[PDB]
Structure formats: structure tokens, C-alpha cells
Amino acid sequence: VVANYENASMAADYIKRVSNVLPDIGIICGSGLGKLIEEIEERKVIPYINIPNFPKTTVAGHVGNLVLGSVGGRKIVAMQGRLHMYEGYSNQEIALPIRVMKLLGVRVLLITNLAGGINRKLKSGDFVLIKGHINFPGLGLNNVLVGPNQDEFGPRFPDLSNAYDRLLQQLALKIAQENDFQDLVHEGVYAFNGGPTYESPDESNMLLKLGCDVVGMSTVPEVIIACHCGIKVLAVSLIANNSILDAENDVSINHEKVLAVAEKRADLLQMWFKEIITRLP
Amino acid sequence: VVANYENASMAADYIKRVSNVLPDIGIICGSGLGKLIEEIEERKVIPYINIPNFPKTTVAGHVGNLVLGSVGGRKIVAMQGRLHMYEGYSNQEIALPIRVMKLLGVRVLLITNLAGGINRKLKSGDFVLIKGHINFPGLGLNNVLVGPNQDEFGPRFPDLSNAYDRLLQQLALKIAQENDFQDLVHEGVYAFNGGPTYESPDESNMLLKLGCDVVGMSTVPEVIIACHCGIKVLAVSLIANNSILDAENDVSINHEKVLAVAEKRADLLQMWFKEIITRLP
Amino acid sequence: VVANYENASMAADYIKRVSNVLPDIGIICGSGLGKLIEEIEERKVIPYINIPNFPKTTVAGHVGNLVLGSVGGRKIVAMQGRLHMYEGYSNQEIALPIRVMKLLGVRVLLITNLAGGINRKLKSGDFVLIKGHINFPGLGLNNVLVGPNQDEFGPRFPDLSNAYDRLLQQLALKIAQENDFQDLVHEGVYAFNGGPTYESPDESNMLLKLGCDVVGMSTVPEVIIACHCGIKVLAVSLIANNSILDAENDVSINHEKVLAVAEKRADLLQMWFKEIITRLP
Ligand SMILES: Cc1cccnc1O
Ligand SMILES: Cc1cccnc1O
Ligand SMILES: Cc1cccnc1O
């Protein structure tokens, strides 16, 4: 199933009939960082498997729902259970849910992820406001837009220089200052590692030389689809570890340690994003 | 359809029956840089869709013809409407037209493209004679030669150290000097970005550190297929912008601006390549 | 055919019925470096084409056998005829033979390859004990583990920081010292170039800047599958040339020259690996 105008329209039609919500904001939340979705008011949960043309996710299993409702008086749509390219989903499967968001009325997309720290100033538990990226899959002929262009959504050759909205970064930082946690908030450049293996010690050393501040396995595909169709983006990484220090000390990373950092910061991130949603222009 | 000896032979047979031209030179021209094709003498236009085993191009649409005839007393074959890998064409679809050129008798391939400038000496409107490349798709398991080797055309493991003929570069520069436009002509290393998004500001900064002079989304696949089967290559980039300066000044690039640079230099490039064709050893 | 638990089990069942050997050690040998396989004692040769669920290799042709028997009193299984990703084999085809080794009882995998030298200390004929890697395909969305995770074999997100066992490196060096050829033995970081074109002169210059000591077209996929399922690895590169010196002197590389270096070092490598097998803890 191609992520074209007709197929996205069929999915949006189903959603509109079932939910009655016309959302202005979309959210995609990282692993262990989804508690806000359970607090959406007057909400409606729609399993992906019920929506025409949504990608099949039963090989991976686990949760996969679209959730619509209100937060802070604002109408939102959330993806609960993200699709990642290391699972084998195609370009067309990643793009269709974002293009459905566009047809539903979404103008701003807020995204969180877990990532590894490269810059020496980053510690476990820090947040990074993403200001740009290095897209190794895109340089290497695996960009999410490889294929025919869907002209109704955007241009053949997008410019990504303003993909990460500067005013949204400034609002996120302002709110951190108001609540006295700005000491945890940095800005930086995100490297996309296709995955699913964590960056090796020598890959980490290379990324330091190349100007990367953080590295992870998600987010860049969604950012590119959103920028192509005119949706503004705020993307925030939660830092699980510093991969450069770990290489110098021969210390390992694993999914258990990552999820423990997520649990440590989940409630603060929930409060922060609730306020961002409330304050969006 | 595999780009093998039998399938390439069937296409060449059709072409020979229809055109009567036995070409020694092939040309592939960049977007907005194809006016020379409309001036081929005693010419024959063959739509791709009519040629056995040529790749299907109707999803992308737009022009797609093989044009044969004479320029400067020399017999040539041109591709009008290039196939680019960001459109989703496979390795086999890119390679078949170049291998048909080989069977028709082509010994020299001349290629032009539009590209972004990385080296600080490059301005919009400059030309770069390509002397080597950095093939991000090839390092990342998307080389145009991934697949079984077609032994009739070339070896399993090609050496690319002489892919860009030095004497052809020297002839191109000599002709620029004769016509007093050598101040526009540089040499440099070309980075292949799979595309279709333009290099991001932070990707541009990385490429500067890695020794890249220019970056674009084409050319390297065709060069590799030509080198594999013993065809000599001259490749020239027309510079649309300097991506490093644009990053320092927060200035955007887009296809409209690219095509305007192409229109500004089209007539000079046409005159230059006509003389190169005439003077080839 | 997916490299899952059921399919790997069917292949292992066939092998066990035919060979009667329960191996503790697996070996994968580079081109021209397979003489040790012909000296396995009380051996059994099983063509890949006869084993249920093994990948089809008839397009490439050439040899493809699993060989079981004894070396130095130890039970081993060897792959004779390696599968390389530049031939077009999928992730699932590369992984299945390694996962069969795991089900047969393999705890240690020994691997050899031919590679290009980047570090200025490396000459043709030198050996490099691999201590880490830079996986360009993995960064670029072509990691061997892209796809659903096979949970019976290992975790969704592997850590590769200890993929190259330190004690096995130390044993290999100890044996070189005992036989007075330690002057040929170095350690280093291996860059994976998907291939099949040799690294270009400008790619070589880039790899020097990025901290790479050697570059080749194999090994990293097998290492990752082995690490995922808990098999310890020793990987050794035989250096065919120094690509940085060749770029400075405009000298070419080719498969003939590579195979001549293999023939020059084959007997010494055979003796070294026989002793390593005998001495493994
Ligand atoms: C998610 C993650 C955590 C730590 C390091 N690297 C990553 O990709
Ligand atoms: C064609 C092009 C123009 C300007 C920058 N980058 C590119 O790839
Ligand atoms: C196998 C090989 C030999 C020399 C240089 N590069 C390579 O990949």
C-alpha cells in the first residue's frame, strides 16, 4: 500500500467517522515515555488494525493504537506504539500515518525519543532539543522519500534547513526555566543510526569527530515526512548514557538500563509536554 | 528484467534496426542542460517505452527518449530524461541503458549534473571537473553493482582509481582557456547523496570535514557501470549554490533556484560540450 | 525463508543425522585461505544445496559446502564458500548458517578475510587482529539485523562492545610470538564497505580521517549474528595492499594481486589457526 493521497484519505475518513475530534497537534512518544497518552481527555482509542490502509504490525506485536482527544484545551492525535525502520517497515508504511495526520488537520508534531550521548557535556537523564540532523540512511540511498513523489503532499526535492522550528525550541526552553529544570536542557545535532545494534565504541568515536551531539534509531524519518508536507516539528531526545565515556571505561549499554532512565524522567517529561501543548501559539 | 548480456542485446538489436547510426560517444545531460540534444544532426528519437527491456518510467512520467545522430562530425547517442536512484529504480534498471551503449559501440561517456558546492572556492555558476568520488550508497550496501556479476561486461571487483579520465579533464580545461572562461572551471571530489532531500546544514558541515568539494544525487551509479565495462568518462558538475555559506547565513535552496542557474549557464555548456565532442581523440 | 528457530532447527536435524559430529568451534575462511578445511580429520562434506533451508547459491555458482570433523582433537564445523552481501543475499540468508552453527553447539567462531590497509603501519602480507568496527551498512539502514527480531536467538537491541573477544586476541598473539612471526601481527579497527568495488582513492583518504585501520567487504554481518546469539569471535584480516600509499602513487588494486598475497601467506595462516584451535580454553 503506497502512502498516496487516495489511501491516506480513506484512512482519514474512517477516523473522522469514529472520533469526532479535529486535531491541530500530533504527538509521537518514545519507549517508556507514553504516560501522557493515558491522560488525554474525552478520548477515543482506535487500534491500527481497524483503520483502512494502516501498516500491518502483528509480526512485531505489542501495542499499536491511534488516540484522539483533548489536552490543555487543545485537540490532539497521538500514535501509541511507534513504527521504527529497523523492524523492516518500508518507506510507505512509515509515511502513511504522518500523511493521515496532515489530512486530519495537524499543523504541529511533537516527538520524543531515547538516544545515546556523544557531546562531552551530556549525562544520563539530560534532555536535548534537536536543532538539525545527520541522516546516514539518506546519504546511503535509504531516505524515507526514495520512491515516486506524492505531489499532493509536497515537492520532489525538499529543503530541511528549517525542519526543526526555532520558536518551538525557544518555548520548550522557556517552560524549563519557569520550572527550574533548565540545567537539564541542551541543544544539539542528532545522528540517525538505522539500528537495531547500539552504536559500537568505534562508531561513537567517529561520530564525535563528525560533529554529532547525540545518536539514535528513530525520529528523522518522521521529521522528513512532516517537513515535506508543511508540518512544524519539535523533537526532544532523552539521553540514556554517554557513549564516549562508556568506550573509554569499557562499560556496556542495554535496553534495561535505557528503560530505567525513561522511568526516572517520565513524569517530568509528561508535565513539560502538557505545558508545551497548552502554550503553543 | 536483469541488466544481462542477452537482455541488453535484444535492446541493441531494436535500436540498430531503427536508427542506422553506430555511435562512438554517449551523453547524459543534467536537468535544464539538454539543449544540445535538440541540435543533433540527422537525428532519430526513440521513446524508451518502445525499446525492448528498457525500464518502465510512467510512474515518474516526463520525457524519456534515446536520441541518435551526429555532432561535430561524430556519431553519438544521448539519453533524454535521466533515471535517478532516488525515484526508486533498481540497480538493474540504471545499468541496462549504459550496457546497451556499450554493445552499440560507445567508448566515451560525457555526463553533466547540477550539484551543491562545499569547497569555499566554489560559487553559484561555477563548473567542477570531477576527479574522484565518495560513494555513500556504495559504502552502505547500496552500490549499483550489488547483485550477481554480469561477467561478459566486466569483473566482480572493479578498481575505480582511473574512473575519471585524466586526458579528458585536460581537454575540457584547454577548451575553456581557448574561450576565456577558465576562471569558472575548478576540479574536485564529488560526494553522492542518495537523496531526494538536499543535504542538510549539518550534513554539509560534515562533508567539508571529510574532504568533499561538491555534493549531488546522480552520476556515480552511471560512472561505476561505465568503468566496469571499459567506457572512459568525463563528468562535470554545475554548481547551484554554496551549501556551507548558506548554512552560516541561514539561506535555503530549492528546485526553482537550481533551474535558474541551469538556464544562466545552459548555452555556454552546450557550446563547450559541442567542442569537446568535436576534439575527442 | 526466514532465519527463525524452526527453520534453523530443520537444517540442524539434517546435519546431525548425516555427520555424527557435535562441533564446539566454527570457522569461516577468506578467499584463497581455505586449505585448513581440506585437512579436517574424519570429515564429512555436505553440499549446501542438500541441506533444508540453506540459501540458494547457484546464480553465483562455485563451491558451497559445510564440512565437519576434527582438528587438533577438537570438533569443528567449517563453511567452504562464504556468502557475501555484495552478491545480493538477504539478511535472512546470511544469518541462517550462523544460527544453525549455534543450534549444533558452536561456542567460538574463527573468521579470516582479505582487506585493504589504511593505517600507515600496515604493509601487504601483514595480519590484523580486529578489535572493533565501523559498520557503514548498519548506520545506513542495511544492518544484518534489520527485520523482526528472532527472540530465541538474542535481544532486540544488541551491545557490540565485546563482540571481539579480548582473550582470543591475546592467544592469537601469544602463538605468533612462540613461532617468531609477531612482527607481522597488528591490531585495528575494521571498516565495512558493502562493495563490490574496491574503496576509491578519495574514500580511502576519508577512512584515514575517521579512525579506520583496515577496510573490507565481509565479516561484520557474521560477527553481528554471532554476538546476538552469544558466540565468541576472533576475526583476522590479511592485508593485500596499503590503499593510502597506492592513492599517493596512483597504483591500482585488483583481484589477481589479492589472490597472490593470499597464496604467499596461506600456509602460515593454516599453521597459526590449527594451533589456535588446539589451544582454545
Ligand atoms: C536508544 C539508545 C540509547 C543509548 C544509546 N543509543 C541508543 O540508540
Ligand atoms: C542538485 C543540487 C543543487 C544544490 C544543492 N544540492 C544538490 O543536490
Ligand atoms: C579484499 C580487499 C583487498 C584490498 C583492498 N580492499 C579490499 O576490500
Q: For chain B, how far is it from start to end, CA to CA, in angstroms?
A: 36
- Our CA-based measurement puts residue C215 at a distance from the nearest CA of chain A, in whole angstroms, of 14
Q: Which three cell numbers stand for residue B32?
A: 535544464
CA distance A235 to B231: 48
Q: Which three cell numbers stand for residue C63?
A: 563451491
3-class secondary-structure state, position B193 = coil
Residue of A nearest to C163 (CA): A200
Question: Closest-lying ligand to the alpha carbon of B239?
Answer: 2
Q: Note whether A193 and A211 are within 8 A (CB).
A: no
> What one-letter code names the amino acid at A110?
L
Q: Note whether C87 and B91 are within 8 A (CB).
A: no
Residues A187, A193, A194, A200, Cα dihedral to 10°:
-150
Residues in chain C: 281
- Residue closest via CA to ligand 1's atom 5 equals A116
Asked if the peptide bond before residue B196 counts as cis, ω within 30 degrees of 0, the response is yes
Task: Classify residue C125 by burial, with Cβ atoms within 10 Å: 0-12, 13-18, 19+.
Answer: middle
Q: Which helix (H) or strand (E) holds A31?
A: none
Q: Note whether C238 and C30 are within 8 A (CB).
A: yes
How crowded is residue B63: how many other Cβ atoms within 10 Å of its Cβ? 12
Q: For chain B, positions 204-223, list CB contacts with chain C under 8 A.
A: 209-211
Residue indicated by cell numbers 527518449: B65
CA distance B253 to B242: 10
Task: Classify residue C41 by burial, with Cβ atoms within 10 Å: 0-12, 13-18, 19+.
Answer: exposed
Q: Note whether C83 and C56 are within 8 A (CB).
A: no
Q: Note whether B5 and B152 are within 8 A (CB).
A: yes
CA distance B225 to B109: 11
The CA distances from residue C247 to A234, B133, B227, in Å, are 45, 13, 18
Q: Which three cell numbers stand for residue C124?
A: 601487504
A142: contact with B, CB 8 A cutoff = yes
CA distance C68 to C226: 19
C140: contact with A, CB 8 A cutoff = yes
Give the count of Cβ contacts less than 8 A between chain A and B.
106
CA triplet A96, A100, A106: central angle to 5 degrees? 130
How crowded is residue B209: how many other Cβ atoms within 10 Å of its Cβ? 14
What sections of C140-254 are H helices per DSSP?
Answer: 166-178, 201-209, 220-228, 243-249
Classify residue C32 by its DSSP letter.
T
CA distance B80 to C243: 38
3-class secondary-structure state, position C217 = coil
Q: Estimate to the nearest angstrom the gap between the alpha carbon of C184 and the chain centroid.
A: 20
Strand pairing partners for C135? C192
Q: Note whether A71 and A274 are within 8 A (CB).
A: yes
CA triplet A195, A200, A204: central angle to 5 degrees? 100
3-class secondary-structure state, position A209 = helix
The partner residue sitting opposite A197, judged by closest CB among C132, C136, C224, is: C224
List of chain B residues whose C-beta atoms are within 8 Å of the C-beta of residue C248: none
The partner residue sitting opposite A252, judged by closest CB among C143, C155, C161, is: C161
Binary contact (C196, B149; C-beta < 8 A): yes
3-class secondary-structure state, position C50 = helix
Taking each helix axis from N to C terminus, what angle separates C166-178 and C255-279, rounded to the nearest 10 degrees? 100
Q: Note whether A215 and A116 are within 8 A (CB).
A: yes
Asked if the peptide bond before residue C23 counts as cis, ω within 30 degrees of 0, the response is no
Task: Classify residue B72 by burial, with Cβ atoms within 10 Å: 0-12, 13-18, 19+.
Answer: middle
Ramachandran region of residue C240, left (φ > 0), alpha (ψ -120 to 50) or beta? Answer: alpha
A146: contact with B, CB 8 A cutoff = yes
The CA distances from residue B255 to A156, B79, B196, B247, in Å, are 9, 22, 11, 17
B140: contact with A, CB 8 A cutoff = yes
Q: Note whether C44 and C135 are within 8 A (CB).
A: no
- Residue closest via CA to ligand 3's atom 2 equals C115
Q: Note whether A108 and A234 are within 8 A (CB).
A: yes
Which experiment gave this structure?
A: X-ray
Residue indicated by cell numbers 548558506: B246
Residue A39: name the closest of A277, A261, A236, A226 by CA.
Answer: A277
The chains in contact with chain A, meaning 3 or more Cβ pairs closer than 8 Å, are B, C
Strand pairing partners for A133? A190
Decide the pairing of beta strands A41-47 and A25-28: unpaired
Strand pairing partners for C47? C65
CA triplet B178, B182, B185: central angle to 5 degrees? 135
Strand pairing partners for B113? B237
Task: Classify residue A39 by burial, with Cβ atoms within 10 Å: 0-12, 13-18, 19+.
Answer: exposed
Q: Note whether B258 and B240 are within 8 A (CB).
A: yes
Q: Which three cell numbers stand for residue C47?
A: 553440499
C217 close to ligand 3 (CB < 6 Angstrom):
yes
Sequence-ordered list of residues with C-beta below 8 angstroms from that of A6, at least 6 positions apart, any chain: none
Question: Closest-lying ligand to the alpha carbon of A158?
Answer: 2
CA distance A162 to C239: 46
Strand pairing partners for B110? B27, B234
Residue A101: name the closest of A233, A189, A203 by CA.
Answer: A233
Sequence-ordered list of residues with C-beta below 8 angstroms from that of B151, at least 6 positions apart, any chain: none
3-class secondary-structure state, position C222 = helix
Residue C62: name the closest of B156, B152, B141 by CA.
Answer: B156
The CA distances from residue C216 to A194, C118, C195, C272, in Å, are 20, 11, 8, 22
3-class secondary-structure state, position C226 = helix
> What one-letter code names the amino acid at C75?
K
CA distance B81 to A38: 52
Cβ-count burial A122-138 (b if 16+ within 10 Å, e if not):
bebebbbbbbbbbbbbb
- Residue closest via CA to ligand 3's atom 6 equals C116
Residue B187: name the closest of B255, B237, B241, B245 by CA.
Answer: B237
3-class secondary-structure state, position A137 = helix
C253: contact with B, CB 8 A cutoff = yes
CA distance B19 to B23: 10
Strand pairing partners for A68? A44, A77
Q: Which three cell numbers stand for residue B132?
A: 574522484
Q: Which atom of ligand 1 is nearest to the CA of A113?
A: 1
- Residue closest via CA to ligand 1's atom 2 equals A115
- Kindly state the greatest CA–CA separation across chain B: 56
CA distance B91 to A163: 31
Strand pairing partners for B114? B238
Cβ-count burial B235-256 (b if 16+ within 10 Å, e if not):
bbbbbbbbbbebbeeeeebebe
List of chain A residues whose C-beta atoms are within 8 Å of the C-beta of residue C132: 200-202
CA distance C101 to C81: 15
Residue B276: name the closest of B131, B132, B160, B179 by CA.
Answer: B179
The chains in contact with chain B, meaning 3 or more Cβ pairs closer than 8 Å, are A, C
Q: Estimate to the nearest angstrom the gap between the alpha carbon of A14 and the chain centroid.
A: 24
How crowded is residue B16: how many other Cβ atoms within 10 Å of its Cβ? 15
Q: Note whether A64 and A46 are within 8 A (CB).
A: no
CA distance A240 to A255: 10
Q: Note whether A200 and C224 are within 8 A (CB).
A: no
Decide the pairing of beta strands B25-28 and A185-192: unpaired
- Our CA-based measurement puts residue A201 at a distance from the nearest CA of chain B, in whole angstroms, of 19
Classify residue C164 by its DSSP letter.
B
Q: Which three cell numbers stand for residue C4?
A: 527463525
Decide the pairing of beta strands B185-192 and B127-135: parallel
Asked if the peptide bond before residue A47 counts as cis, ω within 30 degrees of 0, the response is no
The CA distances from residue C145 to A143, B266, C28, C91, C148, in Å, are 18, 47, 20, 7, 8
Binary contact (C136, B135; C-beta < 8 A): no
Q: Which three cell numbers stand for residue A264?
A: 526516572
Strand pairing partners for A233? A109, A164
Residue among A82, A84, A114, A118 to mutate when testing ligand 1 (max atoms within 8 A of CB): A114
Q: Note whether C25 and C110 are within 8 A (CB).
A: yes
CA C144 to ligand 3 center in whole angstroms: 21
Question: Read out DSSP for B55-97?
Answer: PP-TTT-S--EEEEEEETTEEEEEEES---GGGT--HHHHHHH
Q: Note whether B109 and B77 are within 8 A (CB).
A: no
- Residue closest via CA to ligand 2's atom 4 equals B116
Residue A18: name the closest of A63, A69, A54 by CA.
Answer: A69
CA B256 to ligand 2 center in whole angstroms: 11
Strand pairing partners for A112? A236
The CA distances from residue B19 to A2, B15, B34, B65, B75, in Å, are 39, 6, 20, 13, 12
Phi first, then psi, for residue A188 (nearest 5°) are 180, 170
Residue indicated by cell numbers 593470499: C262
CA distance A252 to A249: 9
How crowded is residue A242: how many other Cβ atoms within 10 Å of its Cβ? 22
Task: Classify residue C29 by burial, with Cβ atoms within 10 Å: 0-12, 13-18, 19+.
Answer: buried
How crowded is residue B1: how many other Cβ atoms within 10 Å of its Cβ? 15
Which residue ranges form the domains of chain C, and what is each CATH number? Answer: 1-281 (3.40.50.1580)
B216 close to ligand 2 (CB < 6 Angstrom):
yes
Cα radius of gyration (chain A): 18
Residue of A nearest to B201 (CA): A161
- Our CA-based measurement puts residue B261 at a distance from the nearest CA of chain A, in whole angstroms, of 16
C114 close to ligand 3 (CB < 6 Angstrom):
yes
Binary contact (C143, A86; C-beta < 8 A): yes
CA atoms within 13 A on the CB side of C261: 22
Cβ-count burial C212-228 (b if 16+ within 10 Å, e if not):
bbbbbbbbbbbbbbbbb
Residue C1: name the closest of C82, C93, C104, C64 by CA.
Answer: C93
Q: For chain B, positions 50-89, list CB contacts with chain A under 8 A.
A: 59-60, 85-88
Decide the pairing of beta strands C74-80 and C25-28: parallel
CA triplet C206, C210, C213: central angle to 5 degrees? 95
Residue indicated by cell numbers 580521517: C209
How crowded is residue B60: how many other Cβ atoms within 10 Å of its Cβ? 17
- Our CA-based measurement puts residue A132 at a distance from the nearest CA of chain B, in whole angstroms, of 6
How crowded is residue B25: how many other Cβ atoms within 10 Å of its Cβ? 23
- Our CA-based measurement puts residue C268 at a distance from the nearest CA of chain A, in whole angstroms, of 30
CA distance A117 to A191: 10
Question: Closest-lying ligand to the alpha carbon of B198?
Answer: 2
Strand pairing partners for C16? none
Q: Note whether C97 and C13 are within 8 A (CB).
A: no
CA distance B20 to B12: 11
B12: contact with C, CB 8 A cutoff = no
Residue of A nearest to C211 (CA): A206
Question: Closest-lying ligand to the alpha carbon of A214?
Answer: 1
CA atoms within 13 A on the CB side of C20: 4
Classify residue C198 by its DSSP letter.
P
CA distance A207 to C9: 40
